[PDB]
Amino acid sequence: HKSIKEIEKEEIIKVLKEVNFNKKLASEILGIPLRTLYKRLKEYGI
Amino acid sequence: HKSIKEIEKEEIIKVLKEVNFNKKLASEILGIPLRTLYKRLKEYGI
C-alpha cells in the first residue's frame, strides 16, 4: 500500500523522467513551485 | 582575502541572522529567488 508521501514521490520522479530532469518544466507540470521541487528532491536525497 | 563565494556566503548568513532565519524575507532582502536561497543553503550544508 502506498502512503501519501510515496504517491507524491512516485509522481515527482515520473514527471522528472518524462521531461529529462528539466526541473522547471517538471515543477510546472506537477503544479508546485520550483523551490518546493528543490526541497522534495533534497529530502529524497536525489 | 575573501573570494566571491565567501562574500556571497557571508552576506546570505548575515541577512538570515537579521531576520531570524525567515527564508522568504531573507530572499527578498538578498534580491534572489527563494529557490536560489534554498540551493545555496543546501550547498553550504546549513
Domain boundaries, chain B: 1-46
- Determination technique for this PDB entry? X-ray
Backbone angles phi, psi at A10, to 5 degrees: -65, -40
Distances (CA, A) of A28 to A25, B34, B35: 5, 16, 14
Eight-class DSSP state of B43: H
In three-state secondary structure terms, A1 is coil
CA dihedral for B4, A46, B45, B33, sign (positive or negative): positive
Cell of A2: 502506498
In Å, the largest CA–CA distance within chain A is 30
Cell of B9: 556566503
May I ask the CATH architecture of the domain B1-46? Orthogonal Bundle (1.10)
Cβ–Cβ under 8 Å, residues B36 and B8: no
d(CA A12, CA B4) in angstroms, rounded, equals 34
A-chain residues within 8 Å CB-CB of B33?
34-35
A-chain residues within 8 Å CB-CB of B42?
38, 42
Task: Inform me whether the C-beta atom of residue B46 falls under 8 Å from chain A C-beta atoms.
Answer: no
Distance from CA of B1 to the nearest CA of A (A): 32
